[PDB]
């Protein structure tokens, strides 16, 4: 347990072995204390010395200890990560990727992951210094299973951070260069590699349709759907986010998710005990029911309309809001027969019950859906029978309440629904 002052004295000794012992002491402070004194180490001026130790090819022990110390400094706040970058650490760590010692190479991988993890600017700076080619070179083996497990997890995680963040998204050419390795990782049977590989794919699909397309073109949707059914929540969470991202794209991109068999997983996703899974699954459904009528029909055929009735009836409120969107999208683009089916499944009562929500947006969304359903009933001449159903379950009074509702945008719909179907 050295003091920072003694570490400084050791590192200033210009005795390589004294410097190694002091760098190890610094590593132990940074790795073993519960509040490690990162700012004290930075204020002491040690980062430039640590960075210069990364180049001591003749003393691989001090390369490792300084790489570890700098890794942990870079794991902190953006200002602490910036201190590491400002000391010249990026090119030094990239050079260390070529070390013949796997534990040192791996430590450089980890440190670069922390730097890129800070945000898009340091991510793009790591890329501009040329990290991608040597990172990918470490994974250029015929079978990933011959690599050490911890080593492969660290590389996967660092590559996922190079895929991470928007404003801006990563450079298109970097994504194109990383994707084949990422795809291979996505097929590797280590649950931690799979989780982080899924996380990377979820970042790359979180963008415009052109970004979605370069992922979908690599043929990963069947594997994402397989991972969608995993037992490990750390895998299902990013797989579902990536699937949800993809169906925000074109109808054709959405069709590849359906073709791959994703909808057969949604009975369990839409009833999942983890609130966030249910919410994301219902969000995903809302962007599928915003699709074509044949895509709505596959939602019907897989039996998912009763599950949407269920989440609308009872779920966390944010999940109920996504379900209200799913219904408004369904009623907006569905056929009359599909909308009739929705009503037969019991959508009206849970829809009316949510008109008591304090949230203004969900009220708007629901009234829109009710408008769409009446439009279907107009083409069948059944507008009265529906207004009976709505009054029968107490929905008519909530319509009455809402044309005294403060917000600008509930009146015109309450108003009009009454003028047309209730007076």
């Amino acid at each position: 347990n050295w003091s920072v002052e003694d570490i400084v004295k050791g590192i200033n000794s210009n005795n390589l072995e004294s410097q190694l012992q002091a760098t190890q002491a610094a590593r132990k402070l940074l790795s073993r204390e519960k509040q490690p004194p990162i700012d004290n180490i930075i204020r002491a001026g040690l980062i430039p010395k640590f960075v210069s130790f990364l180049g001591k090819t003749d003393c691989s022990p001090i390369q490792f200890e300084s790489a570890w110390a700098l890794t942990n400094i870079a794991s902190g706040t953006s200002e602490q990560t910036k201190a590491v970058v400002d000391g010249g650490a990026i090119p030094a760590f990239i050079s260390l990727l070529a070390s013949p010692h796997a534990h040192i190479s791996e430590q450089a991988v980890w440190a670069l992951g922390n730097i890129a993890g800070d945000g898009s600017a340091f991510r793009d700076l790591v890329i501009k210094h040329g990290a991608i080619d040597p990172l990918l070179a470490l994974l250029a083996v015929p079978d990933l299973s011959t690599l050490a497990c911890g080593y492969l997890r660290n590389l996967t995680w660092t590559l996922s951070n190079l895929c991470r963040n928007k404003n801006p998204a990563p450079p298109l050419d970097a994504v194109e260069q990383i994707l084949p390795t990422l795809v291979r990782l996505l097929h590797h049977n280590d649950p931690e590699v799979l989780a982080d590989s899924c996380w990377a794919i979820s970042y790359l699909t979180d963008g415009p349709n052109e970004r979605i397309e370069m992922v979908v073109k690599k043929g990963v949707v069947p594997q994402l759907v397989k991972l969608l059914g995993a037992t490990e929540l750390p895998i299902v969470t990013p797989a579902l986010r990536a699937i949800g991202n993809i169906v925000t794209g074109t109808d054709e991109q959405t069709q590849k998710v359906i073709d791959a068999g994703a909808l057969a997983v949604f009975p369990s996703l839409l009833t999942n005990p983890k609130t966030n899974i249910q919410k994301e699954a219902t969000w995903t459904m809302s962007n599928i029911t915003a699709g074509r009528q044949d895509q709505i029909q596959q939602v019907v055929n897989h039996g998912l309309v009763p599950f949407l009735v269920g989440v609308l009836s009872k779920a966390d409120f944010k999940t109920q809001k996504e379900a209200a969107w799913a219904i408004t999208n369904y009623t907006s683009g569905g056929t009359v027969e599909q909308i009739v089916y929705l009503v037969h499944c019991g959508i009206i009562e849970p829809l009316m019950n949510l008109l008591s929500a304090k949230d203004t947006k969900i009220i708007q969304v629901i009234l829109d859906a009710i408008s769409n359903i009446f439009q279907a009933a107009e083409k069948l001449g059944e507008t009265e029978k529906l207004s009976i159903m709505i009054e029968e379950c107490g929905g008519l009074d909530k319509i009455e309440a809402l044309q005294r509702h403060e917000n600008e945008s509930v009146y015109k719909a309450s108003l009009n629904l009454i003028e047309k179907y209730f007076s």
């Binding site: 991202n245 925000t248 809302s286 029911t289 915003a290 969107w325 999208n329 683009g333």
Partner: peptide, 6 residues
């Protein structure tokens, strides 16, 4: 029927 990100 519009898709909502993200």
């Amino acid at each position: 029927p519009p898709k909502k990100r993200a």
